[PDB]
């Protein structure tokens with residue numbers, strides 16, 4: 417595995433180049449079904465970019481297909497959410513789903529159970545803003561989510577070696593986060609404290625994902641909003 | 657608060673306060689007349705969790721910095737973290753029993769026992785996997801009480817701002833204590849921030865287990881499988 | 897609120 | 906068979 421041989425700057429350099437673009441929403445051709453239509457279409461196109469971004473995450477392509485499938489099935493909504501939170505940092509009180517789709521609590525209230533999750537996302541974006549989260553730290557956190565969010569739900573000495581490789585890449589990303597903070601001028605104590613603050617926020621991103629996944633699976637049962645074939649398979653992974 | 661004792665405590669005083677605040681290990685009911693069924697199983701587990709909640713509340717009041725919060729904020733953190741706290745304690749005491757969950761000294765269940773309850777085996781596997789992960793890491797007692805206090809302070813700090821800064825200031829102190837524990841244990845500076853990361857990443861999976869467990873505990877209420885105590889009812893109503 | 901009085905005691 | 910496995914294998 418070449419991921420283990422990369423330096424800290426090579427790890428950052430690799431992840432930055434793999435960054436997917438910020439996609440646009442279909443604009444002004446608003447009901448509850450219409451906003452759910454925009455969000456589903458938007459998230460649907462982001463999944464295709466996320467899948468190809470995962471193949472560029474160092475160490476990810478060194479796993480079996482089924483382990484690669486498993487990690488994405490588990491983290492995909494977390495990865496979409498931390499993306500939304502990141503690009504919404506410069507818009508206090510706003511969620512920048514897309515440069516042409518700027519929403520806040522005023523739209524979240526016309527979809528049942530969505531304003532609660534909107535408040536949590538905004539608090540996360542407010543938190544990243546108060547912490548002055550950097551682009552290099554962001555790509556490290558997103559890679560951590562991909563590799564960690566499903567590592568303890570895997571199912572042999574071969575499977576244990578694959579779980580062990582994931583923990584080796586995770587240690588490599590942790591070293592990279594510390595190198596970034598050390599290069600920024602933070603003391604050794606400030607490095608450990610900031611590393612801890614960033615990683616605890618991931619627990620809140622997991623929480624927002626589970627809370628959101630629960631509503632998304634009830635939306636499939638209602639059959640009122642049509643979700644594409646890829647989204648229905650990502651939803652069935654969490655209900656199973 | 658700025659006159660908090662948590663901020664004035666050293667790392668060794670932080671460990672000692674947390675160790676002396678440890679709740680007691682309770683026993684399960686042992687009524688042999690009840691059959692081995694979903695209703696009797698959930699009745700045993702419900703009763704144990706009910707009694708553990710009363711001791712957790714006293715424990716929370718002895719967590720440094722917790723008494724400094726308002727009564728409403730204290731209620732928020734416990735309502736948000738109570739299942740996470742019960743789960744990590746169960747995982748901690750199940751370390752000496754591979755492949756089994758030690759709910760109580762007189763109640764040591766394995767993966768198969770929960771199969772009369774839909775979804776319980778899946779959560780048992782996640783709890784068992786976390787226990788084996790803590791064992792593989794050789795999790796120490798001093799690290800356990802730090803992690804559990806982190807759960808109490810972090811899990812709800814973003815869903816409710818000088819009190820926000822107080823919680824984060826206490827969390828930074830618990831980060832210091834964790835590092836001091838690992839340095840005193842003789843780990844290198846690199847192994848320190850890597851192990852800190854590994855421990856904090858497991859907190860995301862504990863949140864994931866709590867979110868899935870809370871969803872099942874709510875459906876159990878809505879199915880009248882067992883009677884629920886009024887305290888447990890208010891704990892569940894906080895999540896829906 | 898049961899959780900209220902349990903915290904005061 | 907999964908579309909994800911289809912997309913990951915390409």
Ligand SMILES: CC(=O)Nc1ccc(OS(=O)(=O)[C@@H]2C[C@@H]3O[C@H]2C(c2ccc(O)cc2)=C3c2ccc(O)cc2)cc1
Nearest residue numbers: 455456459496497500527528529530533628631632635
């Ligand atoms: C009545 C009803 O249907 N309610 C309800 C529905 C969904 C809820 O999901 S979300 O957690 O709000 C969910 C998080 C965010 O808002 C929703 C959404 C989404 C995602 C997928 C999708 O297919 C639809 C929406 C989002 C999102 C989209 C792209 C992105 O890059 C980041 C986040 C919550 C509540």
Ligand SMILES: CC(=O)Nc1ccc(OS(=O)(=O)[C@@H]2C[C@@H]3O[C@H]2C(c2ccc(O)cc2)=C3c2ccc(O)cc2)cc1
Nearest residue numbers: 701702705742743746773774775776779869872873876
């Ligand atoms: C409703 C249904 O069909 N199934 C289903 C039911 C419950 C499930 O709870 S658990 O998440 O397994 C949940 C985790 C663990 O087993 C269950 C349980 C619990 C918690 C509260 C309670 O009132 C009852 C049980 C636990 C627990 C208890 C004490 C403790 O110190 C640590 C953990 C899961 C699935």
